[PDB]
Structures are given as C-alpha cells and as structure tokens.
Amino acid sequence: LDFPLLAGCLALLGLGLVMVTSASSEVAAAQSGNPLYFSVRHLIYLVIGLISCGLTMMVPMATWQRWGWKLLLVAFGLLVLVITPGIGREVNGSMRWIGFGLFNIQPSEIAKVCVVIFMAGYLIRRQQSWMGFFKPFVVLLPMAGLLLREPDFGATVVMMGAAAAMLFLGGVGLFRFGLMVLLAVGAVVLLIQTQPADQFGAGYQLSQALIAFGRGGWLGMGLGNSIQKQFYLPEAHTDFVFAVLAEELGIVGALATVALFVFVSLRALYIGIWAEQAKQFFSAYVAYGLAFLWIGQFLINIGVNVGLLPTKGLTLPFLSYGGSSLVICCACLGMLLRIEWERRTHLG
Amino acid sequence: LDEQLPIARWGDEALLNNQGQAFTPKELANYEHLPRLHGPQRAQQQVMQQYQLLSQLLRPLGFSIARLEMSDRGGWALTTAQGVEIQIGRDHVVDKIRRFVSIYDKALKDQISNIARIDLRYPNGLAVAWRE
Amino acid sequence: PWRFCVIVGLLLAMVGAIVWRIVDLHVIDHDFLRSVRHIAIPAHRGLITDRNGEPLAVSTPVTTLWANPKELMTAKERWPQLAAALGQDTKLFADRIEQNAEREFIYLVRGLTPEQGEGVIALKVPGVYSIEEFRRFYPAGEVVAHAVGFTDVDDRGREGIELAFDEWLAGVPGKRQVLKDRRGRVIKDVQVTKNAKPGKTLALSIDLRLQYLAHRELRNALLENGAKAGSLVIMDVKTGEILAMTNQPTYNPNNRRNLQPAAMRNRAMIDVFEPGSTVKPFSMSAALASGRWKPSDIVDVYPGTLQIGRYTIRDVSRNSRQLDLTGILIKSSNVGISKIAFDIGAESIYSVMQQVGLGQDTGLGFPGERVGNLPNHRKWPKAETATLAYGYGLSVTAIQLAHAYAALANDGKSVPLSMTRVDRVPDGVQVISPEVASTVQGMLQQVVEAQGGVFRAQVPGYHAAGKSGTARKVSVGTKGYRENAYRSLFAGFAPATDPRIAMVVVIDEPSKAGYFGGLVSAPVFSKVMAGALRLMNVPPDNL
Amino acid sequence: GSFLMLLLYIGLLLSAIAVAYSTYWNRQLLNSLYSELSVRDKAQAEWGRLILEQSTWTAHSRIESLAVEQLRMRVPDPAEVRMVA
Amino acid sequence: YWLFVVLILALAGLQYRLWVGDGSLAQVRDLQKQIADQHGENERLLERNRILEAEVAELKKGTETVEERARHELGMVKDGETLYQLA
C-alpha cells in the first residue's frame, strides 16, 4: 500500500485521539458525569472510521462512477432532514445534527464528498461553451443555499473554495474562470445579505487562545497542563483543539502538526498528480478535490484559532471531535489509498 | 441473624453488647446484677470496650466492676463491687491502670476495707481517702 | 502543469504567513501577553506544647476585613458611611483610600471579632470581604512570655522560640489558581497548583507546672526584697533540658500596647554578669583534677587582706585564719582562692571553665543571646589569675552558668542545652572525672548544710547542694562598677545524693534588706527546689 | 516490522491517554486534598477558639484558689508520702 | 525504518511522565495515601476538640471535675487523703 501517507494520517488520527482525551475530560466530567465520555465515544468513532475506511478499500472505484446518483439522493435526503424539525436537535444556534441513537450525524461532510464526486464526474466530460458554465453551478448552489440557511458558514466557504480550486486544476480560462468565481462570490454575498473582550461572557475564546499562545513557549508545558481549557472553553475538543495542542506541545508540536498536515495534504494532491499521469482522470480529479477540501478545513481552523479570521466553529480533520467528520475523513483516506492501489496495479 | 449480648446496661434504659450498639430487650428489670454503664449521647462505641478491657485487665486483682461512668469531658469514674469509687481520669487510662495495679500489689495488699475513694488523677501515683 | 506550481506556492505562502504570525505572537509579545490569576493560600503556624501535653502558643481564628480599592472607587459617597464602622474621620479615610487607589490589596481592620465582622459587612459595600486570619494566642500569658516570645502582625516570629523556629512552625504556603475579573473578583476556584503544608507541632522541654511555680515565688521574692529585676533557670542534669525559665519584670504577650523593651529583655540570655564567688566549685574541680591538692588540706588565709602587685584582694571575713577548701567555699575566701590559684595556675582553671561551657555558646539560637567573655591569654598575669579565680573580671550569663552547674551535678558529663523536648538519652563530654565530681558535690553539700553557710537554702526533706554569690554590677561610663548596686546570685542542684534538678536564681539590685546571696536568693532557692522536687516525683532522702 | 510498528504505535497511544487520565486524576486528588485541609483548618480554628475561651477561667492562680477554698485541697506534705518502688 | 527513533523517544518520554512526573500514578498513590491519613487526623482532631468543648461546657457550670486539673497540675490532695507514690 502507501506506507508514508498511511503513517502520516494515522499520526494525525492518534494525535487527535490523545488531544480530545486530554481536552474533553473536564467538560465530560462536569456536564456528563464520567470524565471519560467524549474520549470513549471518540475511540468508538475512531474504530468505526477505520472499519469504514477498510470497507471503502474493499469496494471498487467504478461504483462511484455509476452508483453515485443514489449517493447524492441520500445526501439530498439527509440535507432535507437536517432542516426539518422533529428529527433534528438545535444546539448552539443551529440544528446541524440528526440523531439515530448514540451516533449524531452531520450531513455536511457526506454532502461535501458527494458533491466532489459529481463535480469530478461532470468535469471528466466537459473540461472543454456557456452551457457548461451554467451547468456546474446547479450542482453546488443548492448546497450553499441550504447550508447557509442553516447556520453553517465554514462548510459553504470550504465548498466554494474547494470547488473553485478543483476546477482550476483540470481546465482554466483567462477571464471566464474569474467570471464564474465572481458570480459564485456574488451568490454567497447575496445569501449573506439575506441573513446578516467578552471574557466575562461566552466570547472568552477570541482572546483566550491568543493569551494562551502568548504564554505557550517554545517547548511547551507538557501533556495535559493547559490552564485555559478547564471549563474555560466548552467544546474545546472541537473548535480550539489546535490551541489546546499548542499549549500542550509547545511550538515544537504545533509546527509538527502544521507541517504534517501540509505533508499529508500535498501527498494527496501529488498522488492526484500521479493519477493524472496515470490516465485516471476521475481518480485524479476526486483526489484534487479531497486534498483541497482538507487544506481548506485545516487552513480555516488554524486561522480562526490564531485569530486572523472571524469565529468559525468548524472541526479539524482527524483532530477535532465528531463521529461524522472523522468517518468521512476515513472514507476519504480509503478513497486515496484506492487511488494509490489502481495507480500501482501497473507498477507492482 | 446475630444475637445481641446482654453484657452491659446504658443507664437504666438501654442494653449493650461487646460492640455496644444500643438495643433494648423484652424485659429490662431482670438484670439487677449486670453492671451499670454511663456516657455521653455519642458514646455507644467506646464505653463498652473500655469496660471489657478494664475487666479483663483487673481480673487478676479480684475486682469485679459494678458501675462505670463517663462525663462528656471524658474523665472516667469507676466503681467496684466492694463499694469504693475510682476516678481514673481523662487520658492515659492504661498507664494509670498499670500504676494503680502496681501500687495495689505493693502497698495496698490487705488495705481493702478503709478506703472512701481511690483517685488515679495523678501523673506519678494516686491518693486514697480513708473511712472510719 | 503550472497550475500545480501556483497552487502549491499559494498553499505554502498561506502556511508561512500562519507560522510567522504564530511565532510573532508566542515569543515576541510573551511579556505583554484579567483572565486567570495565580494566588497563594497562607498556612497556619504549629503548636508549641510543654514537656507533656499543655499548649503554650496557639493560633486562633480572627475575622479580618480587607477591600479592593479598584472596586471601591464606586464608593466615593460611601466612604463617609464606612468610616463610622471603622472609627476614623471620613475625610481621613477618603485620603487613606485615595493615596493607595492603585493598590489592589488593602487591610481595613485586623484583630476584630467575627460578630463585629458581620456587623460591619452588613453595609454590603462592594469590594469588602471577610477572611479568617489566624492570630497567635498564648494560654500561659506572661508566665512563659520570654521563653516562647511572640509573632508579629505578619504572623512571623519576632522573639524567643517564635523567631527561633519560624522554619519549623510556620509551614510553607500553598499555591492556588482563580478566575479573576477586571475588578479582581474571583468567578471560579481553579485547580490548586500546590497545597499548603501544615505547621509541625514543636514540644518544648519546659514544664509548665515548674514554670508557674518559679514565676510565682520569684515575683514573691521581688516584692519581698524590693529589687529592680530578677530571673531563674531550671535545668535537668541528665538531658540538659531547660525544664523552666522565667524573667521579671515580665510582659503580657497577648496585650502588646506600650511594653517598654526592658520588659521584653530576656535577662536569662541577654544580661551578662561576673559570677563572683559562684565559680569556686570549678576552681576546686581543677585543683582536684590536677591531683596536687586534696580536699583535706589546710590553707592559711590570714589576715584576709592579701596584696597582689598594686591590687588588694579584700576578703569579706577576716576572722578566720586557717580554712580548708570546704571552709574556703563556705566563707567565700578571696585570699584562699587566690593562693590556690597561684599554686595551681590559671591554665587548668580556664581549661575546666571552657570545658563546662562558661562564657561560650550553646545550640539554642535565640535573638540577642549573648556570648559572655572568659579571657584567654598565652601567659597568666597574677592579677588576671586572681580575678579568674574569684570570679571578677569576667562575664557569664545565667543560662550557661546553670549548664555548668548541671554538668557538675551530672558527674562532669556536660550535655548541650535543648529547650525543645529530648526523646533519646544524650551522650556528652566527660568534662570532670567522676571522683572530682563526687568530691565537689560533697563539698557543695557541706556548704549548704554545715553551719556558717546558707541555712536559708536548705530544702526540707532533701539534700541540697548549692553555692551563693554576689556580683558588683558594672557601671557604664565610669570604668568599674556602680556604688550600692549589687546582684544577688545563687546556684546549685538537688538531691545531693543523686542530682536530677539544677537551678540558678539571680536578683538584680535588692536595696531594702541586703545584698548577700544567701540572704536574698537562698529562701527562693529552697522554695523552688521544694516545689520542683515535689513535682519531679523523686524520692525524698531526709526525715 | 510493520506489525511491530503498529503495536508500538497503539501502545504509545494507550500510554498517552493514560497520561492524560492520570494528570486529570491528580488534579482531582489535589482538589480533594485542599478540601480536607480546609476542613482541618476550620477544625483547628474551632479548637483554638475553644482554647482561648477556656484559658481565661482555667488559670493557674484561679485553680489554686478553687482547690484550696472549695474542696479544701492542700499541698502534700513530704513527711506523709508513701514512696513505693 | 527512520521513524522508529522518533516513536521510541516519544514512548520513553510518555512513560517517564507517567511514572515520574506530576501526572504519575506514583503521585496518584501518594496523594491517595496523603488524603487517607489527612482524613484520619481530621476525625481524630474532631473527636479531640469535641471533647474539649464538652469539658469547657462542664467547666463553666460545674466544679467537681476541675479537681482533675487541680490535682494533676498541682498534685494537691484533700485533708483526709494519702498519696501513694510509685517511682
């Protein structure tokens, strides 16, 4: 298989596991009873994600070429259900999760992978006309509209950025590409038009991570010694897990994580390059899309954590909490390991 | 099912066993000969065991304890079958008992008929009040 | 494809911007970078106990009111209201607050009973809170004031054992984390960084019964003799413990309002004096340790006005011609001691005097514990030898004099002093051979018992063994001494058959009845050993 | 080696989660220890208050006067003492 | 096989922090034993000062038990009593 990519992604996965275990203990103990609640559920999410990655490794690629239509059908079903009441719970200003028991499901990630797959299936057909210009927009504009009517802005931002970049790889115009990008930007700005310090309140996070980084130090203060995570931040294992990692592992660990994210993401883009050289256009394009989705999520998370960008309560791949995000990340992992497998079929 | 041991009386109301938990049986007046024990409200844990150990320790002396009392201060007062009261004192109960046993075996062999009280509340010895 | 290159370059540029920003914030602005506060929780002092079980110094809770002036600027109209609850002028209180407005922690009242604490806080002025500050309290009062000393308002030792054992009594404080605000108010108690260490209980060797006793009859002695001051020391001879020790005039440690420092003056450790005829037993010990002299050697002291160079060694009594060594001690013959010192030489005298501990220091460590001075010379001037023989021209405080007499009573096995209680039997240096020690104890017994000596110092039912003395107090400015200002001294041990208790009794300037040691300090000596020997539970040997 | 690498990595993960759990547990035990020391401090505060209130009445001179007056207790005479060894 | 060194170093550091550092299970047992002994002395001191408040309660209203202290501190005796001393 792919030893380096698998090693890097498993390093990310295990580091996320230890980070959530170290950062969620206080809140789990306080508002959940047993101190090991988020960590124990994260371990189960991790193992089912590994099983799902294996399953995606055991299912052929042409199925995504042919059986994708039902995938987007169920994606549309889940995206309808996330907005209807009764089968959805509203938490922190948004009813993003749908519950089937102990497995709360966020449909944004499955929607993202499905829309990437269909974009690739369209772009393998119409890389080279205005009809093609208008046709790709109906694929993602309903996605952005639904996910922005729901209070979810980071998902729409990563959708737009990933889509624009992964069109930019595989046929780009001179000014018409900028035209479609500007029309997408205008659409999202119109959607924004439709629907438009604080340390004593719940806005503690804006300067909490800032002062935390100020007190972080080069080497850090070791495992589980941060003083800005014990009831200071609810759900810190999801949004500011990178800030917790920074406090816990110093500049050394923080830069190691940033660089290893960069390594695995550029390896994804570069295996997409191989697939392009391997005459597997569908695989190449889906790899480019998945890699840019990952880098977009990573960049927006680090940017909101460092404070360069407004608040964006979005998860971090393989590090933050959430069953859906990790399961979809593991499925993407399986897809990439497949792309390696089909590329290696002629090599080995 | 454990059976309570009628070995001690708490005042004139309750009955005590080796552990000394407060239990009261069907008939109370039957135990005239059983020793009388007294203590504070929070004292059904220690008076009975102190009485048992003191009886075991003073058995070679030929002394059978009649009444045992504890003030809330903790100072112990002891009365025997011969009718002489003993003020053992607050603390150092075992040291004072050994001291009194030695003094009785040495210089109180047959003087057991002219003592009003025996006061052990001394760091060195004891005081004996005499009766005509 | 160059789109590859441009996308990878843009990604690397964003990552570089991120890492540049984070390295800028982490280290460069670390010093610049209301949220969290790291606070220290104080610890409480230890317990000072007597030999067996009686507490001597305890820490008691007292409600102390403090305020945060940052919260108190909102009380510009309320400072006049609050000043009434304090007892200070409203304008003066406002001035006091405004001069320390920048200050975060300020104390308003300390030493206030809790009930008045609720009474004052009933005004509910923001920023005012009550804390359970511990105040040191002394059950024994002025009785053991000098032997325990006291702490200050900062709960730090200042005198006596309190200053001597700050590292043992006052435990190290603990560290805590809190969620402070802009006004300094704490939202939530955050995890304790490091917990406080409880103070360890120090058990003194002083017995409070003997201390009460000695204090009682020593103030009785002062009122009976009308003297300025006095002191007394009790010592166990087998272990060197200070079983009791007192000084007068005393001070009440719990009420320190205008106590003049001479009331604080622990004369048993700060006041130096020449022992006078008190050091005759050490001279005899040297004489019988050399082996030249014998206890049954007749010494002629006539006419009692021996001349040495330009100096005259006057003797108190000139009516006795021939006097033995025991007679020398009984009569305190300066001529006899001078002659025996000339015969033996002052070298061995100074040897035994440094060996016993006179003029030296001991492992006690008290503030102002003086050292004394026993002069040492390579040669031996005749007048110097005489003065060393009969006591003058020297300075020794009462504590090490008691130590020396305890060593004499301890078969010459001098033991270092230990005011703290001793758990294991100490092993000291055999300063004096057993034969010389036994002989010296015998001569001391005949000194106290035989006629012509100190009849007032005899202890009923006990063989006393002591020696009197008188010190001509030193005058500052005029080289020498001050007229009609003598200190009465007495020291000894009991029972003479097998010593277990030592004593030194010093009374300063008795100007009403007399200045003789056997006239002033002897009855006190007898009374304190009667009581102390009764309490120490030793068998009497007389009937 | 690949299986050995997997076992070593999962052991490292177990060690890391154990370290996190143990650090949280130590924080909890420190909180409990502070609770018990506060209990001990207030108990000794009550004890010191009681001692302060008692000392004003159990004084040596007062108890001497009480013993000699009320119960007519007298200081023992060494002439009449049964010394026993 | 390069990455084995980093994993060995990380596992060694983690085990050191798990057996030596402030988060060690050794410190867990240390604090557990410390709290156990602390609670034991709490209960003993509560019994002690409860006895103290009981005796001060008797002191202010009674006199028959002040004889305990009057004859322990002073060794005093009443007129019709004889001291039997052991030494």
Short mmCIF file of C-alpha atoms in Angstrom, two decimals, chain B residues 92 123-125, chain C residues 209 534-535 537:
data_model
loop_
_atom_site.label_atom_id
_atom_site.label_comp_id
_atom_site.label_asym_id
_atom_site.label_seq_id
_atom_site.Cartn_x
_atom_site.Cartn_y
_atom_site.Cartn_z
CA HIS B 92 -3.59 7.73 79.94
CA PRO B 123 0.96 11.75 86.85
CA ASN B 124 3.02 9.74 89.37
CA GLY B 125 0.79 7.91 91.86
CA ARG C 209 3.95 23.43 86.41
CA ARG C 534 7.93 17.51 94.70
CA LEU C 535 6.65 17.87 91.13
CA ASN C 537 8.43 12.94 91.62
#
